[PDB]
Amino acid sequence: WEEQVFLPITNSISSEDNNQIKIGSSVSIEYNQNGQHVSQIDDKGLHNILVLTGYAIDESTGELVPTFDPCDYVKGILISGKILKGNHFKIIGIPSNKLYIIRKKDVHGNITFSLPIKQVDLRDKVTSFVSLDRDVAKTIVDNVLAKIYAKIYNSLNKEQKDKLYRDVEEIFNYYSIKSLKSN
Amino acid sequence: WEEQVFLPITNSISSEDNNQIKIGSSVSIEYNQNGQHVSQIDDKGLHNILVLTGYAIDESTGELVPTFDPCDYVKGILISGKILKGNHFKIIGIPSNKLYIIRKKDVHGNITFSLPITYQVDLRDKVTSFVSLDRDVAKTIVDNVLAKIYAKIYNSLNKEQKDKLYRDVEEIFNYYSIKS
Incomplete structure (x- = not known):
């Protein structure tokens, strides 16, 4: 596997010009348009979603925060690419069978991947x-997944594209962390 | 709460001179003799054990490794003290109710604690x-570690209550060990 980056799927992500996804104010990810992505779309929907338990996301900054609560999670896709802005933590050569991957499809071997993170207070x-707002989930499919997986997506018929939307709305619930006394 | 340290309980830990527990070759932890410990002993046994999930231990070095596998865990006690040897990761004022604590007794408020761990895991x-803990080792853990950390309560326990602590330690402490 090519090195991967965890792209958190939240209500605040946006596509930015030229193969970049803004996760939040402090985190931007680039993806390789012709790279081999662990997360995959096909005629049956979205596959190989990573569930990062013991983590929440600071939604405004885009940084994952370890919360030490196993009932917390953030989900995302793994794609060939890199964190261009933000702190990255790299997991090197982890057996894919070790990872918390759902909707599994043809996952095998060892994966190296990086997470956008940021003592913890x-x-x-x-x-x-x-959960994803349903309008935002549509923009995630039309502006994000349709850019990363442009060729596959453009090959899908209407029923298949709607399956991908349903998948996105079903799957990408997450825990966000916020300060109560500071902004 | 005074600041705590996560003391992993493995087959390789031992008491060392002057208020120290050697976890492994890279990690030693000092306990404050008069500190207030989150983990506690009483006439019903051991209480407030932390289950650290997503981590396994390098048992020889004593260092905790993030494995990003939710099925890995290492169990341990939280005590007032310091990581004297090894690097540390400090969590500040986490609400106690968010932590994966078992055998809970009067868990309230929030907890600052440190874990014995550049920005990667290989x-x-x-x-x-x-x-799982060898029984001979669980016994030495009670007799040489817990009996020092909790000397005043331990010395106040009768024989059967001391032995209950040992059965508790035996049953509770198992963990995931990472081997290269």
Whole structure:
């Protein structure tokens, strides 16, 4: 596998000009348009989604935060690419069978991947379960997945594209962390 | 709460001179003799054990490794003290109710604690395996570690209550060990 980057799927991500995805104010990811991505779309929908448990996301900055609560998670896709702006933590050559991957499709071998992260201070902070707004999920499919997986996506018929939308809306719930007394 | 340290309980830990527990060749932890410990002993046994999931231990060095596998864990006690040897990762004022604590007794408020751990983990040529405590070692852990950390309560326990602590330690402490 080519080196991968974890792209958190939240309500705040946006496509940026030229193969880049803004995760938040502090995190931007580039993807390789012709790279081999672990997460995959096909005529059956989206596959190989990573569930990062013990983590929440600071939604405004785009940085994952370790919360030490196993019931916290953030989900995302793994794609060939790199963190261009932001702190990255790299996992090197982990057996793919070790990872918490759902909707598994043809996963095998060892994966190297990086996460956007940022001592941890959990004073005065609340973590909340968030689901994707349904309008934003459509923009995620039309502006994000359709750019990363342009060729596959353009090959899909309407029923298949709607399956991908349903998948995105079903799957990408997450926990976001926020400070109660500071902004 | 005074600041805590996560003390992993493995087959390789031992008491060392002047208020220290050697976890392995890279990690030693000092306990404050008059500190207030989150983990506690009483006439019903051991309480407030932390299950650190997503981590396995390099048992020889004593260092905790993030494995990004939710099925790996290392169990341990939280005590007032310091990581004297080895690098540390400090969590500040996490609400106690968010932590994966078992055998809970009067868990409230929030907890600052440190874990014995540049921005990568190398899991190539590595496999984690489940390990349980050898009974001979659980006994030495009670007699030489817990009996020093909790000397005043331990000395106040009768024989059967001391032995309950040992059965608790035996049953509770198992962990994932990472081997290259």
